[PDB]
């Protein structure tokens, strides 16, 4: 009804009015060369490489910012456009420093490739080049600013995507330099993404510095397990060793960004690893032993002790196959004490209804809502990609945010309604003024963080927010489907566990102390030996022994997310799978294989013997754990609300304080992050000051 016809090299293409010349060219397939244009960031038009020729027009237009009009024929390969590209690249390459052998961008440098394709093969520059003093912005991004082409893409990314306005320019002319002027580290959860944004080696990954070349690393696609967003990543490994994590575009989960805890945490999978099985000797000292001895010990203890004295506290980074394997193994000994480190209110519907513990309207739905109400959450650190999506919707759609928890730095400005739990009840009763806004918004959204559920009054908070959702649902201003209630999880191996039937808590252990405990990747340290009865057999199956394995008696080494092909479910309900990039170190094996072999040794052999068989069993327990990259929308909010309005649990007076309220708390959260060294340098950088990040970045 509005499509306008534009020509690209003669071909006729229907383009929506407002389409730029670059997108019209992309429709045909031609990719206009560019440096300063990023489809996620704003259009700048300063690189001047998108200069393309329009027929019957004696002026090369900027395809990155020029909207097409009817009858235009974009001559991409015209002689004038080719000469313009050659001149612009000559200007770019004039003052560039001869750092290609020493620059990590070498082999994946946009400048190098565009020079190879759209550019000359020599130089007519017979003068002295410029040189720019390097600038320090922390222990993550090494800056060699003499390589900067001043595309200002990092500045735009910091301003819009990251929110913090600490990057910019200084001066004019050839001496105008991109930096922070005063010394101030670019500290944000999404800071490392600037390394991807920079088309040149001006901004580079410090942990990856001078370690590998782009053409030699094997790329394996996988799913992040640090946070609960489930960002898709590419593990680049060479010589059977993880080298770096890059983002992979998904446009729903993480756009094309990742957090810092996702990027600079691969080193965590190189220290404090469990490689060979450990058993307690006659002094109670952990000693290396063959798999046979440890498995025999565990099998004997499982055979002897049965009933409710058998238990398993699933960890936070565990997969879905291992969870179902452990569930079946403990079910065959009639043990239904499968607990999880995280606590989710089981009162009322509980895990019975999926929508009770799911971010129902998906991450991509945030870009549609008009009012967002976050309750007792700090999405900046709990789920950095979710906060990035909220900011993205805040910029364009002018979405209005409202916080019920403690005041924090959420990049974008929010309206702090307060920090007391009682406010929720007010919004339920309509006494609070914001209720009017909630009833006036056509696409309202209510998000409750899983950290808020960690409190003693989690059931009361869930009941209050469900009352909010029902109150705004009875008024039909909310559109047809528009699932309002949302629960934002933090632990990756939570939703899947809640899908399988694991108890959303650890209270089963305290209520019924078991004489054997299967710590499966459990490192939160919620339950210790003091809570357990004496002479308790503790089994730890994990990769990094930090808070768990020291407590256990058998330290059966498990496999990590980069070392297994396994299913993880994000907070929206989508179930993705990570693929193997490196094999487990030493004698460590896959988690599900360990559980199945233990079941075989103990006698109660599990049916599944292959990964496909375990996936089939996962389908048997839950059919939505195999529909990979498919959000299975839940329903029946009314039933969950009706079951919720029976407990009448009373809110407390303690303010809703998120566990993480500063950058310092974001880094060292899980076992891999704790064992890593770069996150230690990061917490050091943020804690004391700027003096801890000085280094010779000249090379």
């Amino acid at each position: 009804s509005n499509l306008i016809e534009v020509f690209v090299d003669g071909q006729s293409v229907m383009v929506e009015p407002g389409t730029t010349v670059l997108q019209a060219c992309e429709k045909v397939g031609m990719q206009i060369p560019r440096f300063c244009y990023h489809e996620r960031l704003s259009v700048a038009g300063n690189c001047r490489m998108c200069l393309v020729e329009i027929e019957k027009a004696p002026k090369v237009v900027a395809a990155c910012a020029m909207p097409v009009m009817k009858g235009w024929n974009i001559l991409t390969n015209s002689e004038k456009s080719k000469k313009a590209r050659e001149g612009v690249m000559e200007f770019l390459l004039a003052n560039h420093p001869l750092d290609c052998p020493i620059c990590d961008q070498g082999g994946e440098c946009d400048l190098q490739d565009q020079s190879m394709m759209f550019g000359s093969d020599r130089s007519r520059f017979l003068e002295g080049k410029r040189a720019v003093e390097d600038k320090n912005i922390g222990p993550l991004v090494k800056t060699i600013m003499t390589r900067c082409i001043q595309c200002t893409r990092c500045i735009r990314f910091a301003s819009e995507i990251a929110g913090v306005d600490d990057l910019g320019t200084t001066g004019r002319g050839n001496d105008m330099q991109v930096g922070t002027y005063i010394e101030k580290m670019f500290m944000s959860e999404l800071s490392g993404n600037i390394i991807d944004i920079c088309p040149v080696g001006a901004l580079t990954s410090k942990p990856y510095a001078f370690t590998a070349r782009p053409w030699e690393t094997r790329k394996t696609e996988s799913i992040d397990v640090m946070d609960a967003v489930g960002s898709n990543i590419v593990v680049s490994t060479r010589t059977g060793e993880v080298m770096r994590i890059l983002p992979r575009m998904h446009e729903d989960i993480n756009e094309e960004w990742i957090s810092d805890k996702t990027r600079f945490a691969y080193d965590g999978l190189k220290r404090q690893r469990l490689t060979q099985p450990m058993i307690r000797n006659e002094k109670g000292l952990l000693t290396y032993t063959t798999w046979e001895d440890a498995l025999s010990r565990v099998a004997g203890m499982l055979q002897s002790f049965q009933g409710n004295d058998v238990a398993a506290i699933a960890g936070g980074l565990v997969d879905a196959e291992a969870l179902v394997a452990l569930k079946d193994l403990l079910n065959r000994v009639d043990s239904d004490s499968l607990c999880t480190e995280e606590v989710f209110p089981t009162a009322g519907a509980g895990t019975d209804l999926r929508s009770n513990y799911l971010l129902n309207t998906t991450i991509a739905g945030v870009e549609e809502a008009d009012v967002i109400l976050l309750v007792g959450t700090n999405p900046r650190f709990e789920a950095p990609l979710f906060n990035a999506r909220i900011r993205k919707s805040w910029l364009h759609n002018d979405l209005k945010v409202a916080l019920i928890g403690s005041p924090v730095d959420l990049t974008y400005r929010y309206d702090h309604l307060g920090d007391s739990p009682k406010i929720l009840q007010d919004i339920a009763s309509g006494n609070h003024p914001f209720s009017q806004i909630l009833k006036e918004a056509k696409k309202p959204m209510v998000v409750l963080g899983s950290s808020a559920l960690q409190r003693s009054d989690g059931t009361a908070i869930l009941a209050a927010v469900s009352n909010i959702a029902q109150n705004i649902r009875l008024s039909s201003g909310v559109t047809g489907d528009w699932k309002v209630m949302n629960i934002l999880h933090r632990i990756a191996s939570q939703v899947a566990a809640l899908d399988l039937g694991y108890k959303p808590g650890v209270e089963a252990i305290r209520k019924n102390p078991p004489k054997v405990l299967f710590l499966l990747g459990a490192d939160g340290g919620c339950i210790t030996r003091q809570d357990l009865p004496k002479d308790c057999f503790i089994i730890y199956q994990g990769h990094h022994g930090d808070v768990g394995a020291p407590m256990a008696d058998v330290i059966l080494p498990g496999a990590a997310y980069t070392e297994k092909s396994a299913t993880y479910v994000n907070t929206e309900g989508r179930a993705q799978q990570t693929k193997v990039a490196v094999t487990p170190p030493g004698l460590a094996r896959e988690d599900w294989k360990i559980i199945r072999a233990l079941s075989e040794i103990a006698g109660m052999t599990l049916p599944y013997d292959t990964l496909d068989q375990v996936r089939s069993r996962l389908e048997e327990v839950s059919p939505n754990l195999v529909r990979y990259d498919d959000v299975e929308g839940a329903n029946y909010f009314q039933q969950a609300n009706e079951l919720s309005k029976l407990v009448n649990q009373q809110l407390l007076a303690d303010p809703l304080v998120p566990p993480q309220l500063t950058i310092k708390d974001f880094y060292m959260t899980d076992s891999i992050s704790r064992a890593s060294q770069t996150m230690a340098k990061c917490v050091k950088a943020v804690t004391e000051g700027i003096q801890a990040v000085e280094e010779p970045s000249i090379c």
Partner: protein, 48 residues
Amino acid sequence: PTTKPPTARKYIWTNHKFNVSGTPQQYVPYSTTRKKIQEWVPPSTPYK
């Protein structure tokens, strides 16, 4: 070398060793890089 002597530098050797194959001064290949994966080094307190 008597007329034109080669340029002198510190790192250049001062005793031209011949083919050291056979003699116990052979060359044995070995990895010149450190470890990649570290171990957990379990604690010493019996505790349990």
